[PDB]
Amino acid sequence: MDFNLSNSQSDIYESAYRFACDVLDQDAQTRISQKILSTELWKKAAAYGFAHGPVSHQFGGSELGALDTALMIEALGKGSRDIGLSFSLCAHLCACVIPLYRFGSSELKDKYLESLVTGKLIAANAATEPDAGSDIYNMQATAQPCEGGYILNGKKIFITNAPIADVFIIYAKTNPDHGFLGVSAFLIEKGTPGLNVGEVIPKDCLSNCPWSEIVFNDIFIPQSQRIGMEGAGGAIFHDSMIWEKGCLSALFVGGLARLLETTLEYAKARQQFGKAIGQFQSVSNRIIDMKLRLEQCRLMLYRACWKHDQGQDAEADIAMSKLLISEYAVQSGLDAIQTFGGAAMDQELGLVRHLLNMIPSRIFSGTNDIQKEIIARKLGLRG
Amino acid sequence: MDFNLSNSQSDIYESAYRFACDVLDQDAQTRISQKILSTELWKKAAAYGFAHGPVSHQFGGSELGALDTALMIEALGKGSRDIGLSFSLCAHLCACVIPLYRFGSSELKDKYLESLVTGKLIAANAATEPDAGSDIYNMQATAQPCEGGYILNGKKIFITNAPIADVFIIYAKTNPDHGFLGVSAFLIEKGTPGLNVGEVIPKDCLSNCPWSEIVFNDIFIPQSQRIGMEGAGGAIFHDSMIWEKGCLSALFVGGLARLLETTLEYAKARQQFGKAIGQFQSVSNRIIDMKLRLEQCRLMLYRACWKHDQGQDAEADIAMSKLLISEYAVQSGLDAIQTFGGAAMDQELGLVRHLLNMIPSRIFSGTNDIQKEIIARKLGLRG
Amino acid sequence: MDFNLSNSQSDIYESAYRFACDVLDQDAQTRISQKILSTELWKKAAAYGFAHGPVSHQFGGSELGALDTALMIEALGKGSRDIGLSFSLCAHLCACVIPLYRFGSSELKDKYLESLVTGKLIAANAATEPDAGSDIYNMQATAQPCEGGYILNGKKIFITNAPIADVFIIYAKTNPDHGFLGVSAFLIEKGTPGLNVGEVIPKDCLSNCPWSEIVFNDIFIPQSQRIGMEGAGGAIFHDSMIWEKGCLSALFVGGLARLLETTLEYAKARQQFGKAIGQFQSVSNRIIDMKLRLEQCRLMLYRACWKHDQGQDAEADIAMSKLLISEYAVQSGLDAIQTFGGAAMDQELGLVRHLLNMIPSRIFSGTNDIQKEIIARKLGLRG
Amino acid sequence: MDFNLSNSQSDIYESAYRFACDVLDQDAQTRISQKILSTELWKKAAAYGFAHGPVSHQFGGSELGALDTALMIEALGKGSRDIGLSFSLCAHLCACVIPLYRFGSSELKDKYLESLVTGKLIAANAATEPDAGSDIYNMQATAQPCEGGYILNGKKIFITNAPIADVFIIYAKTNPDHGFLGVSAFLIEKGTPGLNVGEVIPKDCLSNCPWSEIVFNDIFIPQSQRIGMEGAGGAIFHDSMIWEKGCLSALFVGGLARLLETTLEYAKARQQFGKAIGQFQSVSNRIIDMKLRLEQCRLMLYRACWKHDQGQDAEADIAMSKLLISEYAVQSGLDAIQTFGGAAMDQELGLVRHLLNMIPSRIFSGTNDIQKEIIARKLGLRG
Ligand SMILES: Cc1cc2nc3c(=O)[nH]c(=O)nc-3n(C[C@H](O)[C@H](O)[C@H](O)COP(=O)(O)OP(=O)(O)OC[C@H]3O[C@@H](n4cnc5c(N)ncnc54)[C@H](O)[C@@H]3O)c2cc1C
Ligand SMILES: Cc1cc2nc3c(=O)[nH]c(=O)nc-3n(C[C@H](O)[C@H](O)[C@H](O)COP(=O)(O)OP(=O)(O)OC[C@H]3O[C@@H](n4cnc5c(N)ncnc54)[C@H](O)[C@@H]3O)c2cc1C
Ligand SMILES: Cc1cc2nc3c(=O)[nH]c(=O)nc-3n(C[C@H](O)[C@H](O)[C@H](O)COP(=O)(O)OP(=O)(O)OC[C@H]3O[C@@H](n4cnc5c(N)ncnc54)[C@H](O)[C@@H]3O)c2cc1C
Ligand SMILES: Cc1cc2nc3c(=O)[nH]c(=O)nc-3n(C[C@H](O)[C@H](O)[C@H](O)COP(=O)(O)OP(=O)(O)OC[C@H]3O[C@@H](n4cnc5c(N)ncnc54)[C@H](O)[C@@H]3O)c2cc1C
Ligand SMILES: [Cl-]
């Protein structure tokens, strides 16, 4: 039992924090105001190491564990205001790079993986459908086996990075008899005949992180573009979501550390009735809640990632961390706004934008109600 | 003890609801998207009766009580998506029309009141300052008595309607010896020398409801433009805030009724795992919270306004209603977003915009921490 | 819309309050300490009017509506510390007297009803079973039709008043083919062969309100002791629970009014750090929550009972009031303890005992989770 | 960063757990029912090691750190239902043994310390007064210096173990000019002239853990019985409370682990409506809250104790852990009762007694409002 980072981990965190502050946070306000995802800046971040994670040196990666990867992402969330870009980059890492590395054939990895790890190519993960959100294994897109590969039809929605992606990691049914056991995963390139990528659909939350629908109209998928074995697509999706929930969520821990520092400074400086507003217990009690939340969810995050790195079953731990981080990120965003009062409306300071950016954290990679269902199942309550 | 509306009250509510749906809600999505406050549409709403409240027939008003006025505003909040326009109109009524009617001289009312009641003129209330928010009686703007009236200097911030107002109801110290007893109220016209109205300052919440700063540089206020007696400005401000907290807050009760209907319809229609999502208790428990909140805060609102109409001391009741409505409006906005999941990001449906519009309700007219301080004082805990 | 009591209602409340203070609360501390239910005192309360409710003058009652009955019970909850006795009396009224009056034949009412209304006889309602709590229509006790009546077998648990009852209102299946439509209700006398009333089972909550199990071993029920029609027992039980949830819950509104007055007095009188503890916002914020809860749940209670008296469908309103009153009674008990600190441990003052007495309010007459299921069904979420 | 116990720590926990189950939990139900604190059993627990903590081998101790000591206490809280005895023992360790070891002279330690570490003698800590609870440095008891020592007068209340203690660690003012700097600490023996120990005062929470008032009437304290330096009594008290809040609170973490296991088993076994009640999300969502709380507060506890063992400033960490453990212990007690419904009233199972035992955890060693004030001060909000 030890609660210090190693020297190596401290160096990883500090280097990522410096890059986030000195590279990505530069001119963030202009990109945020204009709703710009700068692909050239995204690629520099990818190549720095944010697209690497556990990938081996063979493919340009850093062989990091889950805890190391989470520390880099926590630093990114604390140091850069451009959380939409950070979310886009981390989705590419956790839901696209990592499954290709963990399950792709040698041929597929040799063709695509280093390009994704360096950001030469941007990827999008396409699983969710109009009638398959939480009930993902109800997906209806079909990859019908045929001579030489598959014929793919269907529609995916809510696809982060789709408007800017060069490749798509898609999940579809190769056996409509089954749910989970009937899904396979495939890599398809932008421009393939029959792949219709929709225009960006605007949103107020994470507003410069592009998403859109994609429609498959009779796409031919060559056999060599299947990721993993036939029917393994549910397991591949599940594994990718463990990585996304475990490490991507660290963004919001770093964002909460930043928010709490801003909120503490204001509560010490702003005076009403002849005293700092932090001296009123209505004000300080909320700030203490923010502090309590930050410390608890950071420890839960670190333990979930450490358990994964030890080879232990961390599924419940990752569901608990994803739930706590996202709940605490939203609640603390509300508490920071309450601390500032009318001053919270300022768009430069961005407290309201911060709350908006935290709202989807309770939805992405499985809603928090679904996290409770996962934990309930691990506790024996779904037998 | 009776919980029905009278026939007259039902007619007032239904007429206001029809106007909100059939006039104001028409083309609201375009104005919301473009961040437009249509002054011509605002004036039609004012003249319909939303700028009338308790004003007598002599000045074009309807002699409504607080409960009647709140019902009209509740209908407005349920029927029109353009809550920024509705907030702007209700601020003009509660913080400008009503104090002028209740405290202005015959001469001032004869010159200005009917124009404000018909919306011929738009008014803004200017009390808050950089160093006087919750601690309003710390305001530093000074109206120094001089031959013929006053010399006014100072700065006001967060002033709803300032960029579009023709007249300003301003509060300033006529005696810097005192706080509350040292404030007077004045009506000043747009264009008076020394009145510098700032450009609109954008915000994400209530985004088409304009606000800005105003600076007074050596303005001469003629004696006849003082509203009420010298030093009564604190009492006038206080009375105006009772009306704003009591009736303007009804907007958010009507908005919660609308939100709950939308949320119920979706939870019945959207299916996952082979059933409507409303069949999962994680989903329905939040919707029941929304229902419980709506019923409780509507009754608290109605009782506060009824008590005022009976001539009873309703200050604690109004503080309790303002606190409950705004807390419940924010919490229910969060719960509706959670019900919809990724579907909540759609900008046309506007669930995220609705949450943004509810966030300032816990701040305007006195924060909810200040409402607790008012209630504490009424309960004898601040002696 | 009116929020005053009538003169008649004010008189009912005040007379009940005086009886609760001047009769029942006398020597309550001794009975509470010794865990005594004084049947002679219970009978005086019954005869005063607490066993009357809506029963007609023909049978000794007062023809009160639900709101009148709730006011009497609210006064009882505020004026008497002996809430175990009050709960016992109100269970007899709402679950035994009222169904016999509403559904019993002329012959059964002529034999028993006036005796129950005067408290000459004490009754217990026996519905719950080991395997039928929330799922009450799963009850397994059987009243098998036979020549002359029925043969009754089964076991009931959690039966308030069973150790002191002279008569039992029992629910059992007359058709094991059905659930709700298969239940009938019967009145059986203490001492009937085969009726085995268990010894009192102690509890820490409502500790002097006796309950026990009852076992039926081949009881013969004569035909004339069926209450209502064959198979109407589910409807009779349901109606009785509407009365119990609607009016019995008023006990806890009166108890919260008493608790809040005690808590306010202490927060003004107790000083630490040179000021009354009510001046610290951590302390006052909880007391304001208690006040907000009291006002909201009293209005919800009154509206539910008024709607019933108007002949409107009040089922959702009664479920909402039962849920809010019991949740707020428990939360406010916790908040009063927090206000007093170590002083809350005093057994004479009884703040901890008060919390214990409120704990079962979230369980009796249907748990609060079941109240949410009822409200969900009324909102169309259980179709 | 590592989240495993060492082999030594696992052995400490497991040995303490076995002793708690196989020695202390034996016949606990009888002692709980009769409100008995068995001093002979208490002494066996003390001698086993529960009175040792950090005390050196010289005095019979085990030289444990704070984390080791907390693990032993967590095991005690999980393994023994007799939490009143466990609280009594841990108060003696943390508030009496530890300050004597850390601050007492060689002469005082040689006379008393090994006897306290073996439980040969029981000690009580007497700091709180009628007018000095949270505001402890307002204590009014006076130890007036005189020839040969001090004359002690005053009154202490809420003193755990006073009715059974052989020695008292008392705090009193040696300089009524100052608060914190004016307090000194002393050891006095039962039977000293002028020491009047009150009779046990009963309570419903921790009901077999005796407490009482003590009155000092002109007690002569010889100079050699002062613990530490003159005026160091505030620092000694503060240090003792760090140990009590840091390690004694582990009792409630172990109790929550036990409660959660009991609650999970019931939610799997109890069926209504044809399924285990754990399958209803209203039920499982609360159990998941219990699980989330247990994991978070155990990690916060372990980190606070580890930081203390590393020589770091752990004051904020200990205040955060004491607050979270006690809040989560109370909330989880409420949630377990809600899970069981009417079955929670059973006195043998003791769910209601468990809630009662957790209620004072939010008060002892400083209320949770005071913990927030400590954290606020550490965050710079009390400057
Ligand atoms: C920012 C963001 C980025 C995203 N990026 C991607 C991406 O790149 N690729 C991709 O494939 N998808 C992506 N998604 C989609 C995401 O996976 C879905 O939003 C998620 O699976 C939830 O599905 P849904 O939104 O359809 O909600 P629904 O499943 O319709 O849920 C609606 C409500 O019902 C509740 N509910 C549903 N089932 C249950 C149940 N069994 N028990 C209890 N409650 C239940 C939910 O918790 C929620 O409250 C993204 C979403 C967001 C918000
Ligand atoms: C939508 C909107 C419209 C507005 N329109 C107008 C307008 O037209 N005219 C106008 O004059 N003003 C207007 N205002 C300003 C409004 O009156 C102020 O925002 C309000 O008075 C709060 O002051 P503040 O924002 O400076 O917050 P502060 O007073 O700085 O409060 C900051 C924090 O400290 C807390 N706090 C302060 N004092 C205490 C205390 N004693 N106890 C406990 N907590 C305390 C607050 O509750 C809050 O959490 C508007 C504001 C909003 C949001
Ligand atoms: C003070 C008191 C007095 C009583 N007096 C009487 C009396 O005089 N006569 C009598 O007949 N009975 C009486 N009862 C019993 C009472 O009716 C039952 O306690 C009640 O019906 C709940 O059943 P249960 O206790 O078996 O809990 P269970 O039904 O076992 O419930 C256990 C848990 O599962 C939850 N749960 C169950 N089903 C669902 C569902 N569908 N959805 C979500 N959650 C669910 C519950 O809410 C609870 O959290 C009394 C109870 C109390 C506490
Ligand atoms: C189980 C138990 C065992 C105990 N054992 C001992 C023992 O052995 N020896 C001993 O000396 N004492 C003991 N105590 C007493 C304990 O130290 C006091 O209860 C504690 O210091 C709180 O003081 P109080 O109870 O007088 O509450 P008060 O100080 O009167 O507090 C009342 C309320 O005011 C609040 N409050 C007070 N000041 C502030 C503030 N500045 N800001 C915000 N809120 C504030 C509190 O949080 C609380 O809500 C024990 C108490 C308990 C419950
Ligand atoms: Cl305060």
Ligand SMILES: [Cl-]
């Ligand atoms: Cl469910």
